[PDB]
């Protein structure tokens, strides 16, 4: 009943807060300026990028360096998402081969979902909200890097319109991970049994937490089908980038994921 679905929504929220250091809550505070913390270092060109090495973690050319930065962080995201998934009741009880497959396909969908939390039409928060890299700066990069992040901005503008909060996103993300239709699953039934349960939890959350916004649930499920198309575009631009660029190596964990994908 309602109770069991509120308890799930709560369990998932608590787990989301632990798994993800920078929530949408903190992210919005920073972007509006309503924080009592220092405004983040604005990176708008090669000069400001250079001056802003003192706030980022890179551990040879600009576009490539930015991509190595985005690559480092993107690996920490997979680890955060992986620990979150382990908290989704019954996810661990699944076939370990299924757990891998769900994550393999799910993480990019969830990375673009949670990127939108850090985005506005002008730019994206980086290095745990203490940097802000502008959209125009990322467009102005030389191709193929020129329009690598642009489709994420386009999505985030539309997605942020739904004004979802952390408690909504916690469940939305769980629903994306438990997609019983990922290529190469072995035991679909117990995946769908959990997603079914998560979708009720999500629907109830959206009624309680946005009782003026009607069929936000419907709108949100339409967006979930956009992400796939959007993630395929991304996978192929990366496919291209792997080939055309000789110098830069791709991180092992990313290679695990992207190999045998679409």
């Amino acid at each position: 009943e309602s109770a069991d679905l509120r308890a799930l929504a709560k369990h998932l929220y608590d787990s989301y807060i632990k798994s993800f250091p920078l929530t949408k809550a903190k992210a919005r505070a920073i972007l509006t300026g309503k924080t009592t913390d220092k405004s983040p270092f604005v990176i708008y060109d090669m000069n400001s990028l250079m001056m802003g090495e003192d706030k980022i973690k890179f551990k040879k050319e600009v576009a490539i360096r930015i991509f190595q930065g985005c690559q480092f962080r993107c690996v920490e995201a997979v680890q955060e998402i992986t620990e979150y998934a382990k908290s989704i009741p019954g996810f661990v009880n699944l076939d370990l081969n299924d757990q891998v497959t769900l994550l393999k396909y799910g993480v990019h969908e969830i990375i673009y979902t949670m990127l939108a939390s850090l985005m506005n039409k002008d730019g994206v928060l980086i290095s745990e909200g203490q940097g802000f890299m502008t959209r125009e700066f990322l467009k102005s990069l030389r191709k193929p890097f020129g329009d690598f992040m642009e489709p994420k901005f386009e999505f985030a503008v539309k997605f942020n319109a739904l004004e979802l909060d952390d408690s909504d996103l916690a469940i939305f993300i769980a629903v994306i991970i438990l997609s019983g239709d990922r290529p190469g699953l072995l035991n679909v039934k117990p995946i769908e049994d959990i997603q079914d349960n998560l979708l009720q939890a999500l629907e109830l959350q959206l009624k309680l937490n946005h009782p003026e916004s009607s069929q936000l649930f419907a709108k949100l499920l339409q967006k979930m089908t956009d992400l796939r198309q959007i993630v395929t575009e991304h996978v192929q631009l990366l496919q291209v980038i792997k080939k055309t660029e000789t110098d830069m190596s791709l991180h092992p964990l990313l290679q695990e994921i992207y190999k045998d994908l679409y």
Binding site: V78, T82, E83, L96, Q99, V100, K104, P252, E256, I257
Partner: peptide, 11 residues
């Protein structure tokens, strides 16, 4: 065979 994903799930 997804060694790192395997380890991240196992850990």
């Amino acid at each position: 065979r997804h060694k790192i994903l395997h380890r991240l799930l196992q850990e």
